[PDB]
Design a protein around this ligand. Sequence first.
Ligand SMILES: Cc1cc2c(cc1C)N(C[C@H](O)[C@H](O)[C@H](O)COP(=O)(O)O)c1[nH]c(=O)[nH]c(=O)c1N2
Ligand SMILES: Cc1cc2c(cc1C)N(C[C@H](O)[C@H](O)[C@H](O)COP(=O)(O)O)c1[nH]c(=O)[nH]c(=O)c1N2
Ligand SMILES: O=S([O-])[O-]
Ligand SMILES: O=S([O-])[O-]
Lengths: 312, 312
Amino acid sequence: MSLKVNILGHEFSNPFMNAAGVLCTTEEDLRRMTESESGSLIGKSCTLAPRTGNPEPRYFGLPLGSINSMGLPNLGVDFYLSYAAQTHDYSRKPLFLSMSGLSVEESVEMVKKLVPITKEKGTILELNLSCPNVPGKPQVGYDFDTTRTYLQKVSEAYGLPFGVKMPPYFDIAHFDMAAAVLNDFPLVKFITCVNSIGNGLVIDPANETVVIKPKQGFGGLGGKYVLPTALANVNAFFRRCPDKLVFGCGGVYSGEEAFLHILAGASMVQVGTALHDEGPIIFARLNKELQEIMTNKGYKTLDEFRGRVKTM
Amino acid sequence: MSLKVNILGHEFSNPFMNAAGVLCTTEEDLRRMTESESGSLIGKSCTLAPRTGNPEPRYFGLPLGSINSMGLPNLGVDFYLSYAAQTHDYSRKPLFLSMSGLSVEESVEMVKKLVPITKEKGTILELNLSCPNVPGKPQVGYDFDTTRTYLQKVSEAYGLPFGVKMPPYFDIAHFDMAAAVLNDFPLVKFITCVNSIGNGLVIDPANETVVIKPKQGFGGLGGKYVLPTALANVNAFFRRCPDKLVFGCGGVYSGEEAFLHILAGASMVQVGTALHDEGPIIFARLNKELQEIMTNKGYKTLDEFRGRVKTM
Ligand SMILES: Cc1cc2c(cc1C)N(C[C@H](O)[C@H](O)[C@H](O)COP(=O)(O)O)c1[nH]c(=O)[nH]c(=O)c1N2
Ligand SMILES: Cc1cc2c(cc1C)N(C[C@H](O)[C@H](O)[C@H](O)COP(=O)(O)O)c1[nH]c(=O)[nH]c(=O)c1N2
Ligand SMILES: O=S([O-])[O-]
Ligand SMILES: O=S([O-])[O-]
């Protein structure tokens, strides 16, 4: 039996990795992800210059998941590039970097710097088009003309296969429109579905007060809230973008959810809120739980069921 | 304490009503809603001609809520108009009708027929701009040009105060753009936030099959999944549309969720999934639970705390 995944020119020991933003901001974070049983890892969504992010409190754990408005705290693109070029142990597992420049001009500058490091080390880019927690910066993926510009300019500047972190869509017409844009960019080799369900609001009934400080309490939702949305997006793009991979992100707490993501079409499975809750030991648990389901169903590889969800 | 709501010249006993679609399709359904302890009720979103809706199975109750793709099964506009004109007991409570024509032309033809009945009986219109379960009909509310056309044509054709059932938004820019359109239409006196989180996907791990038949398993999500989204939408439009009321819909199972909706800005509070699960006896419980919270907090009326959620 094998959890192995062969994509983007690498063997991954298993399909599991962190969701961008979780356990991946500092060198220590990235060390712990590398030492974990995860198949891969991804660096915190970064900007050209460092950021400290939004004021506190900006994260609140919930019974059904999480709400956050972190505000893209990151050590700046040079930190993550240097991590990728010098620090990361590629013999352990491949490395992704998430990049979230807050303009096309910023993104172009950042990805340009990545080119030599991708060529030398094999570092993979996930372009973030969906951060919902930066004041005054709308989610790029909800504007298809803006999305087209980003993909055009990053395709030109970077010139190598890369992936995109998409916001969740909730409308068939939007799946169609998103896919039409994505399918015009052959360098987009993977689509990560999904980022947080944006701009939710949690209120404490006792003190009648919102639970996070930024944006009048409005924050991105993760965890159990998002699983059906995440599965839908995965499957919608799996079908609409057959020349691309899909990575699943959203609501994974166990082997069962991972199994569903993969059945829906996911090549890799990212873990955010649950990883925030449980720490990197979760990857060992997820590997075991997924294998148990496969054992019970008589599956020996992921390929026996990836993208084989049945309809009526 | 008093649960009363006084809007559009009517006295409502309490803020509670069914969400459009739940317990409101047939005469018997509407009788049961009228006989319940609810403050009001709304008829099933109707079309000019009857519809049988989508094939089966099209509804699935979930641990955390519901997924459906009913497909606007309805007895046609004449049935609901005739209910509103002849059958409904207005001494029990006021009546809303939801209308969901699948074209602006259809919606116009429908609302014109309602005009005499509103004038005579006080029947209130909720225009549905958000149904996510009709194949080939995207949610109007996610296209601001189309939304503007509907509001223009319905305002002109109906010529009386009405409300709109909006899809959930997940982006600050969309709140702004939606509000800008709504604020150009003075006859829009209330905004119901929110309709289902559109186009989620639930998969059964045992048989590796989606749980509903229409649209390859894609259906609207209700229940615990939607509470933070609903609260966010309620509060965003409460602040952006001061000339209008906001009605809350989404994730209400208890007086506590009702209290949060009202604290966020809601005038009426609609109950979908929980009502589908428990039956109309739920309304007796919700009144009791909200009364308890107000008593504990020393709130004499809903007006003392409506829209007074605290931020940091
Ligand atoms: C604390 C924290 C921080 C971030 C996030 C989440 C959380 C919880 N998310 C969203 C994340 O990548 C993921 O898409 C969602 O959390 C959904 O997955 P889960 O349901 O949480 O597993 C996120 N996404 C991204 O692309 N870049 C980022 O920097 C962040 N930051
Ligand atoms: C079976 C069923 C049928 C419908 C719905 C839901 C369900 C469960 N919903 C959506 C509903 O009005 C409501 O917006 C959502 O269900 C969210 O509220 P809850 O979280 O379920 O209370 C719905 N909404 C609407 O405006 N017109 C309709 O005809 C229907 N039909
Ligand atoms: O960094 S994001 O979570 O705001
Ligand atoms: O009628 S709606 O529930 O699809």
